[PDB]
Amino acid sequence: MTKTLPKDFIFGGATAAYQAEGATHTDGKGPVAWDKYLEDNYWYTAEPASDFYHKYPVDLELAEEYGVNGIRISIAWSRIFPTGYGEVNEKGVEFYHKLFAECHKRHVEPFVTLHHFDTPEALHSNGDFLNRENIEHFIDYAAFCFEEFPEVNYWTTFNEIGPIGDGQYLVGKFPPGIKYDLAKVFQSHHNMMVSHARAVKLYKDKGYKGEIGVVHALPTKYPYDPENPADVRAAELEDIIHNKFILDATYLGHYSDKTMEGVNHILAENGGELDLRDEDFQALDAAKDLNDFLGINYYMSDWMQAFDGETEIIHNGKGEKGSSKYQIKGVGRRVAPDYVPRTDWDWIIYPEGLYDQIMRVKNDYPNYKKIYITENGLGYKDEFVDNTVYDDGRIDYVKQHLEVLSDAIADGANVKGYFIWSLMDVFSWSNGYEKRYGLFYVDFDTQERYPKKSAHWYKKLAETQVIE
């Protein structure tokens, strides 16, 4: 009477270069914007992180012992080309060959991402992807990796395009630290999607042996009072800002009429210009059906309420329950429903949100082909005891979302894998090394890994395919 998952499902784990690797100034690694920014706006640094640069063999054996048969990893652009372009870095390129080879002998399939919040500094501090020049360097970087790494079967261009625009140009929690700039936000969603549509086409043109797709963040947006049109509209625009715009460029090749309408409105109220070239749309249009899979990242959902007041967004980074604030003029404000559970960082736990997103994608863009849940997990302050962590709360969060996939699948959604964030503990972008998410506890002082209760539970799940 319990739920099950397909016998051939991918039970993976996730990582990100900058969060896990460390060795920020080793073997010729070039700087990234986080280097100075963290040191200047936060209480922690990317060193030593979880020392993946040296620990990958230990993490992989463990991943293998506990049933992990998939792993998301990312290549550090600034490790291959320390300055974004120009000369390749011999030691960097060598490291990834060693890593992939280890994944392979350990039976953990590598899902490789080219860009994961780490544009080499040189180009970041030059307008990042708002600078069309940097689009060119990306495609070049991509093309090189496609050529140099033939051991890789699955490729993803960018990880979370929505969250970058949000973090860098709206909330300002990610460098440069710009706030309430809605023009940048869209121009960036647009520019990065072009970079993607070009990257995927080239991979398809050169005809390599594998699959390429995108990893999109898609938190479900719901109106506070569904019977209130003003609230409905509020969710509509919020969604357009974080999902529609991008989903459209992804599967339509262009932005739909409602997307464009909602966009113009938002820009009328807050001001701004969007630079869209015809050529930009040909590139987008060619790649619409070229995506093999779609990686959905999902953690929470949001309820929108209409609002006419000045925009203000406050980020709860220290995990002080209740400190978040988000209102945007002409859009709406977020109002957390009363009795729904939520973490100390204010992330509403709402499993059915995932199912809704899946069926939405499935119904709006039938050419999605295949879905993989590339990120899903619970960040909280684990209490290390008995050389473990009794993360029954984490097991509960995960168990509920897997149960919701089982239904999505049963209802006609082509979900073929799930990747818990993260395989092991890694520091958080704007929340420090406090917000733990891993299946394996990492004592940052000894870099020693201790399997938590969820690891054991994951093993069982992996090998039985029963969500019990």
Curated annotation (Swiss-Prot):
Q: From what superkingdom does this record's organism come?
A: Bacteria
Instruction: Enumerate the SUPFAM superfamilies for this protein.
Output: (Trans)glycosidases (SSF51445)
Question: Which Pfam family, an example, fits this chain?
Answer: Glyco_hydro_1
Reactions it catalyzes: a 6-phospho-beta-D-galactoside + H2O = D-galactose 6-phosphate + an alcohol
Transmembrane regions listed in the UniProt entry: none
Give a GO molecular function annotation for the protein.
Answer: beta-glucosidase activity
Q: Which residues form a coiled coil?
A: none
User: Can you tell me which residues bind D-galactose 6-phosphate?
Assistant: 19, 116, 159-160, 297, 428-429, 435, 437
Gene Ontology biological process terms, A to Z:
lactose catabolic process via tagatose-6-phosphate
Q: Please give the InterPro entries that the UniProt record associates with this protein.
A: 6P-beta-galactosidase (IPR005928), Glyco_hydro_1 (IPR001360), Glyco_hydro_1_AS (IPR018120), Glyco_hydro_1_N_CS (IPR033132), Glycoside_hydrolase_SF (IPR017853)
Q: In which pathway does it act?
A: Carbohydrate metabolism; lactose degradation; D-galactose 6-phosphate and beta-D-glucose from lactose 6-phosphate: step 1/1
- Catalytic residues at 160 (proton donor), 375 (nucleophile)
**Key words of the record:** Glycosidase, Hydrolase, Plasmid
Instruction: List the GO cellular component terms.
Output: cytosol
Q: What induces it?
A: By lactose. The operon consists of lacABCDFEGX.
Q: What is its EC number?
A: 3.2.1.85
Any other noteworthy remark?
Answer: This gene was sequenced from pMG820, a laboratory-derived deletion of the naturally occurring plasmid pLP712.
Against HAMAP family, the record matches this protein to: LacG
Identify its protein family. Answer: Belongs to the glycosyl hydrolase 1 family.
What name does this protein carry? 6-phospho-beta-galactosidase
